Structure formats: C-alpha cells, structure tokens
Design a protein around this ligand. Structure first.
Ligand SMILES: [Cl-]
Ligand SMILES: [Cl-]
Ligand SMILES: [Cl-]
Ligand SMILES: [Cl-]
Ligand SMILES: [Cl-]
Ligand SMILES: [Cl-]
Ligand code: NA
Ligand code: NA
Ligand SMILES: [Zn+2]
Ligand SMILES: [Zn+2]
Ligand SMILES: [Zn+2]
Ligand SMILES: [Zn+2]
Lengths: 403, 403
C-alpha cells in the first residue's frame, strides 16, 4: 500500500496562494525532492481533520487516491483582514508528500469559512522531471536530536528551528529548545505519548540577534524574517518566508515545525500543519509554545473570546474539534457529557460540570461554545488542555502512529 | 520638482506575476525602503521606452503622475512556452520607485504581443505604513567601486553581482567584473559617455562554486540559484530569485544589474530593466555581456533571425528602437537614411549603406527589418553596435543624465 506507489523519499511542493477578499488562486512555485519520507505509511487516503485546505494525490494510471493531507495557512487568515479588501497579495506555502514511482496528479483546494471550495489547482507531477530540485544532500543545517524514540518511519518528527539567533548564540537556542520540549511533554496526552516522538533542534543561523519589530521601526536580518505587528496586530509574531523555513530543514526528517524567536517581547503564532512561532525569552514562553502547537499540530481552535463583535458563521458547524456552533454537536464532544449536563452550561454551574457547552469561543462571546470553562486554548495561566482538546490531540497522535 | 513629492529614499516593490497562457495576474509581495534614491530626478512622468510592462505612480490627493518606469520580464517569456499551456506559475519581480512624502497610488500593467493590457494592479502605498520593511542599513554585501564618476544622483549606477563564487574565489570575481567593465566601455557610445556611470562590483557569496545543472542532476547552493535547462532549454541559464538579487544589493546605490556566473559553460540572458545574467569564463564573455546589457539597459531587440517560423506581430510597430515592421518607420531611424537609400536595402548593397532597412530581425527572416547588415545585437563576432543602436543607447544615457 505504501511501497506500491512510493519510494522512501519526499516530494516537496511549493505553492503561491494569491488574491484578495473577492477572489483567490493557487499557482505552482517549485517542485523539490528530499532524501527521506518522514510521514505516515497508513491511512494514506484519509484525513485526521478537514483543515482550511486539502491536498489529494492520485495515481495517473489508475486515478486512485494514493495520498492526502490537510492544513491551514497565513494567507486564509490575511483574507479576513481589512487589507484584503484593498490589495491583492501572494503568499508562500509548502507541502510534503511521499515521492511517487509513477506520474501522479496533485490537487490542492482552499475552502472559505462556509467550508466551501474557494480556490483549486490540479497539476501532474512526473517523477523523472529534471526541474524537480534535489535538496537536502549538502550543506545540511547544523542540528542535534533532543529526543530520539525511533526512526522517522515509526515516530512523529518535530523540528525546532532557531529564529534571531546568531551562530554564537546556539547554546542558548539548544537550551530554549530543551525548555519547549519539557513544556510540551509536561502536558497530557504528549506526556504519556512521549515515546511516539522525535525532537530535532535545528541551529538555523541569523545575521542579527533578535526579531523585526515593525511598530518600533526596528527591522533585523534573520533566518526567516519573522516580525511582530502581523496584520497590524502588535503581538502577532509570524513569518511569510515559508520557502526559507523548509530550505533550512532540507535533509533533516520533519513533519512538524516549531520556530523559537530570540526575543523577550511577547508574541507568537500557530497555523495547522504550517508551523508554530513563539517568543523564547518572554516568561510566558512555556504555555505559549504549547498553545501554538495546539493549533499547528492539533488543529485546535482558540477557545478565548472578546465582548465586541465573522470567522465562524453560526449557520456552519466548525471543522475544529474543541468549538461548536451547535449545528452538529453530536460530531463533537456530546459523547463526553453526563446525561444531566445542561446545554448550554451556565457559568454559575462551572464547578458542577468539568466538561460542558460553555458559551464563548472562537473569538465570539455569543453563538460559539467551548468544552470547559478554561483550557490551555483559552488562557496561559490554566495548566492543561481541557479533556476534549486532550482527546483531539490523542486522536492525531494515534492517526500518525497507531492506537 | 522631485522634492515636491519625494524624499531621498527608495520605495522597493516586490510583485508576483502569476498565470498561464490564457490568463495573467499581478499581486503585491512586499514593500521595502532603501536608504537613498539612485534613480532620475527629471522626466519623472515620461518613459524613455514603452517596455512590455509599465509602472505609473500617482499622487493620491491630486491624481497627478509623479513617477513612471517601464520594463520587460522573464514571466512574459515563460508565457510563450509550452509549459504555460499546461500549468499556472508564479515569478518574482522587483521595481524601484522614489519614496513618496504623501500616499501614492501605484499602477503596474503588463501588455501582450498585441500591445494590449494583459494584467493590471492598482494599489495605494502609505509612506508611514509600519509594514514597509526597512532594508540596506546593516550587513551590506562586501563590494568595491570599479568606477566612480560622481554621486548616485548625477551618474547611472550599475551593479555587478557574483553568482557561483565562494568567498575564496572573490579575487577572480573582481577580475571578471573588471573584464565586463572594460568590454562595455570599449563600445561606443559607452566609451565616450564613461563619465556618466558608476560601476560597483558586489561580492555576493555562494556556498558552492559554479551553477546548477538540472539535466545532469547537479544542483548547487548559490547566491541566486541560477540554473541551466530553463523552460527545458538546455543552455538557457536564468535565475528567478529576484528578491535575493535585490536583497544582496540593499544599501548599495543601483539602477541596473549585471550578474556574473562562475562557469565556462555558455549561457545567459538580458531582460529590459530586470537584469543581465551571463557566464564569466566562456570565451564569448566580452561580446555576450555587452549584447545582454544592450537588452537589460538599452531595451534593444535582437537583430538575428532564423530561416524557420508571433513575438512581433507584423501589423504592429515594435516599441524597440533597432527593429521595424515598417508600420511606423518614421518613429525609428528613417531620419538617419540618405535620400537615395533603397528600402528594403538589398544584401548586395551592404557596404554602400552602413545604415539601411535590412530584412531579417527580431527572430524572423521576413517582415522584420534591422538598421545595418551586422551589429553587436545580431552576432558576437561583429565588433560594434550599429549606428542606430548607438543613437538608441545615447538617448537612454541622456534621458537619465542630460544632454
Ligand atoms: Cl480497480
Ligand atoms: Cl468567507
Ligand atoms: Cl540526521
Ligand atoms: Cl528583545
Ligand atoms: Cl447534534
Ligand atoms: Cl564549469
Ligand atoms: Na515520522
Ligand atoms: Na544614479
Ligand atoms: Zn491562539
Ligand atoms: Zn480545550
Ligand atoms: Zn539577445
Ligand atoms: Zn544594432
């Protein structure tokens, strides 16, 4: 089932997502080959989560689905900003697929907030195409394994990258990476499932120490050009240099990316099957890196909300597992409630019901509900993922490594 | 005046040109600021040449044209390939504009072979936007001036970049750059106009020596990732890493770019107001670098042609100054012919008429005409630019630096 269509190599595909609030398009940027396939070898035609976008690989000769993955993107978030009503922008996006033996047809799809198709691209990949850029053979970024439970075929490979660390600050980076690892494996279900993971710390160098602070006019030369003030949101620390992120990892087996930023300023970002980015020297580093990994690895939604008032239409059940609009609550955590739990669960009864249907979630105070009064996905001070987030993360771990 | 709308800074705009043979689009990639404006300060609302694409900057408050430039692109050439009928691709393109004091509206337009609009983007640039990336203040690439005739405001600044040269091969690079300079200023009108130019050699390092050869499976880590087999044409050496090219030059004043590739293999190209790329160690380096600069700086067309058979429709007068379809020959070099010069000029009379209307030009043996039997824009063996190419180049030099 894996050996019938694939070789133990990776087909890396770089795309450009372009558009504005009115129309979106996808175009191919570049095809590359990586030396090993670090992804799954089972459930090849199934998705663990829908994502905001999907990739389907089909065998050209038979037309059969041979691989599928899903994700979210910085582009799809940008579409929800005021700037997307005024200008057309382009964004880099990279996806890792198993390398096919015979020609394969790749189809990439983007969906809107109504979970409808908003952009699509279908293209044929010929495995002997001379313009498939061979990567990860030489000048592999210095790295060290923090944790090695097994080979890349049996464990989940997580790569931790250095952002804003010069070559002389790498001992601080490796210490920071060890702290992220300790924070992650102190949370269930990661704690009990630690032997399912490989953690590699990748010493990707920056010319400058620290990160770009656009609001203060302090731009720096760094490995991935990360910056605060993403979408003019002060604490939103992201990078749109997705090709540079993946080029730094070429030759190192990886499935998931965590980026550590060498700064004391508060900030971070996390996007499903894209990457996590976080401050390493702010005191809230430990809950923040785990919260962002909840997004990037877990595909979890934010459970916090604001008082003031469109990202989750109330007529649509979200695909995210830890929030509901009560359209299709049976597909969520209804099976985890007691027979007498009130729906919605009044805030006055929070102590009576550790698991409930609490109004407020996915940035809205009304119409969106979360599974517990508090969670790692709602606040930094709360010590754990709620029971529903824990089940959702365990399902992801088991999808990639078995029951 | 220049000072009425601009500051002594550059607004660098990075775009992505995307599409296929059927439809094309433009989207914004990033806005940057460079410390000085090295371009012109006169004829701000005029174009020296039409180009295959145009940029018009307007003051938002008055709607008045405050800056304009024109160009051609690798994307517009890719549109003519078989691949453009099968897939949608994206290309990086960078343009330097003077930095506005007040909000400005930028309009970028691409034209097809019928000289009609094929893609357009209109967007407002607010000079106080915090997300305008400040560049060229630190980590300025090591460089040396080969020629300094005056400051960046009075002279044409030409930058020569190193491709495929490691840090230990920079003495060879500077020798190669001196050879390119010597070849260029041994040709009229450059020779007599040498005091109108600044030439800077920029030692942009490469991890590997040489350039990528996709057909041989020899991929290299180089400054700008130049490679052979572009568009599956074996000897076509190009780079599409336009952001990396401009990032290497941030902080160094430049208007025109020449890239030298550390290889003996034959290859290169020149695209109007994009860049020249050529191999420094092939024996044809001297006439080739000058021929390509004829394209990238001069906007000149190729005067050579093939026997066998759409880039130049025969019912349209080309915008290039050294070829004609005799649709509007009066706008070309008619004023340089003697009253008795036969039109077309028979090949038997080539010695009698140094300037004529010789059939064969712009890749076609029929319907397109060139100004002399031979020229630097037709062959490598011919020693000089024809008198019409010389006048066209002189008009470009005078447009940017005065009569
Ligand atoms: Cl069958
Ligand atoms: Cl929408
Ligand atoms: Cl390794
Ligand atoms: Cl800091
Ligand atoms: Cl239900
Ligand atoms: Cl060579
Ligand atoms: Na793995
Ligand atoms: Na200048
Ligand atoms: Zn969050
Ligand atoms: Zn939760
Ligand atoms: Zn040419
Ligand atoms: Zn000529």
């Amino acid at each position: 089932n894996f050996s019938d269509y694939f070789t133990n190599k990776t087909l890396r595909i770089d795309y450009l997502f372009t558009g504005n609030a009115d129309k979106q398009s996808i175009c191919l940027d570049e095809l590359s080959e990586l030396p090993v396939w670090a992804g799954r070898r089972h459930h090849l035609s199934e998705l663990p989560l829908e994502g905001n976008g999907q990739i389907v690989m089909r065998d050209v000769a038979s037309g059969k689905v041979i691989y599928t993955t899903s994700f979210s993107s910085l582009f799809q978030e940008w579409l929800e900003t005021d700037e997307a009503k005024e200008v057309t922008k382009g964004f880099e996006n990279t996806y890792l697929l198993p390398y096919p033996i015979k020609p394969a047809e790749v189809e990439i799809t983007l969906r809107n907030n109504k979970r409808e198709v908003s952009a699509n691209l279908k293209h044929v990949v010929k495995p002997d195409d001379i313009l498939i850029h061979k990567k990860g053979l030489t000048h592999i970024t210095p790295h060290k394994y923090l944790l090695k439970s097994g080979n890349e075929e049996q464990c989940i490979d997580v790569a931790i990258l250095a952002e804003g660390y010069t070559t002389s600050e790498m001992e601080t980076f490796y210490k920071d990476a060890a702290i992220a690892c300790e924070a992650l494996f102190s949370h269930e279900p990661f704690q009990s499932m630690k032997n399912r993971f490989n953690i590699v710390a990748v010493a990707s160098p920056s010319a400058d120490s620290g990160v770009s602070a656009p609001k203060q006019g302090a731009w720096k030369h760094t490995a991935f050009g990360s910056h605060f003030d993403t979408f003019y949101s002060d604490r939103y620390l992201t990078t749109s240099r997705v090709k540079a992120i993946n080029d730094a990892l070429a030759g190192i087996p990886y499935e998931h990316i965590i980026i550590l930023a060498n700064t004391e300023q508060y900030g971070g970002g996390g996007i499903y099957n894209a990457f996590t980015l976080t401050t390493a020297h702010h005191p809230n580093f430990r809950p923040v890196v785990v919260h962002e990994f909840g997004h990037s690895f877990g595909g979890l939604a934010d459970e916090y909300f604001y008082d003031e008032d469109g990202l989750y239409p109330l007529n649509i059940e979200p695909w995210e597992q830890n929030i509901t609009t009560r359209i299709n609550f049976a597909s969520k955590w209804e099976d985890m409630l007691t027979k007498t739990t009130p729906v919605p669960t009044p805030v006055a009864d929070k102590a009576k019901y550790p698991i409930g249907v609490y109004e407020g979630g996915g940035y809205s105070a009304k119409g969106i509900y979360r599974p517990a009064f508090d969670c790692r996905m709602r606040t930094n001070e709360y010590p754990t993922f709620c029971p529903v987030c824990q089940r959702a993360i365990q399902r992801i771990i088991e999808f990639y490594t078995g029951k």
